[model samples]
Target: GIKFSAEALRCHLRDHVNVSMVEVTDFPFNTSEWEGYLPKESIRTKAGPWGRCAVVSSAGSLKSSQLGREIDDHDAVLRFNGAPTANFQQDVGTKTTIRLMNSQLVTTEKRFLKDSLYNEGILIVWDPSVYHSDIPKWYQNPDYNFFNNYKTYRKLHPNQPFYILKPQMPWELWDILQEISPEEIQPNPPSSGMLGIIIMMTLCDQVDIYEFLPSKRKTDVCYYYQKFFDSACTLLYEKNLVKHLNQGTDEDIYLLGKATLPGFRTIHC
Candidate 1:
């Protein structure tokens, strides 16, 4: 049985974590910064409320779920990284309202802009910060120089809704995860999947997470789009955190690879 208080937990998260923008003036970049290209409104202001949301993981378990239509049926869909909806549209849906990307791919991937995949939906990129560091310090040195790519992408698609996550936000969530778990969670940042989950929880009435906790089809294959494999990204600690907050049955997690959570607003705090 879950031990944590959902209302208390939600309150804690809301107090510390900031899902929206960092003030443009406080941004670390120079006069020729990505902010100059971006719209005046912050992501939080631009985000409209939703009734239901689907967060699709790129797990190999999604290979044959035939969840595409069901996923697309949701009021909004959030996907991670560069997970494609082209050939695998049958298993993973075509609708993409949000895409959470890591800093690495944004900086290193040569085809980031030329590819239509990155351009679709609202693009949000995040980078790890030294534990509890302020934005000014994190901005001085990031794991990836994704800011350059961010400027380029925005210039190319002026009308697109692209935003850079405030660097301090992930650590805020990390702090909460550390407090709740009995065992020590790694000092590293929370996974993109975890970040995406909270983002949806803030915007929608209920969120349906797919393959985040894995299921019968789970494998060492990692992502469905790439052959890369890393145990760190599996994020077991984050999974335990999700299970604690999840309103869905354990059977939903094990059988269907789905965990349903009520939105932050609906959860009494």
Candidate 2:
């Protein structure tokens, strides 16, 4: 049977796909500043089981401009619940890459986030102080800006205070838990465990940290690159591009200035 590990994920991505990864530590987004302190150990997983990988480069082009307006185009079709088909050569191809949106999916997603914290844009914070605790005080407080509705959040949570939320990649957690199955999630067996307990324990909860970021959007190419790194790792354990997992060389790559535009919206902090 195939196994999953950070190293396993790295090898697979590097060997199979031409995609390269930039580490969070080396990421030159906004370093040497307050924002640089944000938890930067993000992985940029890319590629598939096969050598071929599809990248919808809507970041450049006019024909894709219209389709980009749709939500489906923004959301990568991820097989969250089960083992994705291994037949990548047949199922995924370069032509699949484009700038287009899915109307139905967008509508569904809109309805889902209409009232949730993500109703506007999601704000992500990283506080290193509460490494070993899970109190609401430790998790809450980070300000999220979804859909550019900042005035409402400012007025509503004015006294709420601003802090960093722990590592709560709900989407990633959901995917892994769903894959492990409910039977494995029981307390006795400690079902649905975290992916990186060592890092989470050593880095998070043990340090005093705080940061604020907007919701995740497709237009944020760097964010997508990070997502790609995570996906590539999940799909192929050895092909991952996160430096934390792999003992490799490092460089500098970070973001500067907030991401904001028309269809290219940003979840601000």
For this target, which candidate reaches the highest TM-score against the unseen true structure? 1
Off by over 4 Å in 1: 1-3, 29-35, 227-234
State the lDDT at 9 in candidate 2: 36
What TM-score does each of the candidates earn? Answer: 0.91, 0.19
Mark the 10 consecutive residues where model 2 has the least summed lDDT: 206-215
Q: After best superposition, candidate 2 residue 80: deviation in angstroms?
A: 19
RMSD, every candidate, angstroms: 2.5, 20.6
The stretch of ten residues in a row with the least summed lDDT in candidate 1 is 26-35
Candidate 1 per-residue C-alpha lDDT over 81-108 given as tens digits, one digit per residue, 9 for 90 to 100: 8889999999898888989889888898
Give the distance in Å from residue 7's predicted Cα in candidate 1 to where it truly belongs. 3.2
Number of the predicted model whose lDDT against the real structure is largest? 1
TM-score of candidate 2 against the unseen true structure: 0.19
C-alpha positional error of residue 212 in candidate 1 after TM-score superposition, expressed in Å: 0.4
Clash count per candidate = 0, 48
